[PDB]
């Protein structure tokens, strides 16, 4: 109804990224997670969560696609 457009974008991109990684579409999934990270700005807590959640090589694709 008001602001919070960035918050919607953020969660939608995380969720789509997650879904694509699960279908095995790594580049696309990583693309969308990095859209979420880009709108964060203090993404240190987010990046820790992602590191604990993703297989290491998928996480490394993320750090590179930033």
């Amino acid at each position: 109804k008001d602001a919070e457009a960035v918050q919607k974008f953020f969660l939608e991109e995380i969720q789509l990224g997650e879904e694509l990684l699960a279908q095995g579409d790594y580049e696309k999934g990583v693309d969308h997670l990095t859209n979420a990270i880009a709108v964060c700005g203090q993404p240190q807590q987010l990046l820790q969560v992602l590191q604990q959640t993703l297989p290491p090589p998928v996480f490394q694709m993320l750090l590179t696609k930033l």
Binding site: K1, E4, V6, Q7, K8, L11, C40, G41, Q42
Partner: peptide
């Protein structure tokens, strides 16, 4: 609003 969106973004 949507709490889930607010809470999820709180860390940013």
């Amino acid at each position: 609003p949507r709490l889930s969106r607010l809470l999820s973004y709180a860390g940013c």
